[PDB]
């Protein structure tokens, strides 16, 4: 890829400021695994990751890319395993996160039933890539669904994917996202079908999946309100939209449904997911 040098890092990131990009500053995000800084690396703009157990989730994401190169997936430009801490250099999404866009984090503004079913197409095509090449990602959230300048989604995070049912001690994610399966120790790609279904919601509704001060407090428990004849889907779409069709927005919601089979066999596979989320817009 590149091995940059730390101190080429260190530079480009102005001594990897702590203070935020809101100030000037160069930290973006942080996670378990490290923070995350702009950097600015011969005109180009990027992202710079630093990172219980001292180089795991290292070697797996430089191993899972260079095998995996899709327009539906981060790209990464370099590492860095000299100097004082392991880094990694991505490409900068200048639109951020898809969580951060639901949201309107900063300012923004809401993203339309166009730029979201656009947004919902190129994941599918990213986990479907991922999926074609054995790969099972173990992480699939809206944070983990990046932006670039024109909105295309980009999957992020493969520190965790596994090439491809296996079960297991250390269980990893994001509960609010994981499948039932997943939260028991099953390892399969049926379980990033379950939380894509869960980023589906996500995007109709603009609810994050989990909200402390809301009742339910779980975004896949409307499933069960809407399911359950309560409501109905249209009661929950994102009001901040002036172009959500009922016809497409029940189209998605009916995928959605069909992802968030509790059932692992039941689940549909990317595939069918790609093609059920191509018909809504054609
Ligand atoms: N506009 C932005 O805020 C933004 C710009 N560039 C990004 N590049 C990027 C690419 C691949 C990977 C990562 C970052 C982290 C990783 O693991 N892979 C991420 C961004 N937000 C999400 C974000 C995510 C984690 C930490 C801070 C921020």
Partial sequence: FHSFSFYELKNVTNNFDERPISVGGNKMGEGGFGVVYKGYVNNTTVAVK???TTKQQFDQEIKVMAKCQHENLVELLGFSSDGDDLCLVYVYMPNGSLLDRLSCLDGTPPLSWHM??????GAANGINFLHENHHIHRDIKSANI???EAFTAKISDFGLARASTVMTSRIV??????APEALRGEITPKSDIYSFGVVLLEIITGLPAVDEHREPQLLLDIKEEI???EKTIEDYIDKKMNDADSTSVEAMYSVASQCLHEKKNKRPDIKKVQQLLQEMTA
Wanted: hydrophobic share 40%; charged share 35%.
């Fill in 50 to 52: 630093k990172l219980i």
């Fill in 116 to 121: 979201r079913c656009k947004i919902a197409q």
């Fill in 146 to 148: 990046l932006l670039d």
């Fill in 173 to 178: 994610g994001t509960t609010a996202y994981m």
């Fill in 227 to 229: 399911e359950d004849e």
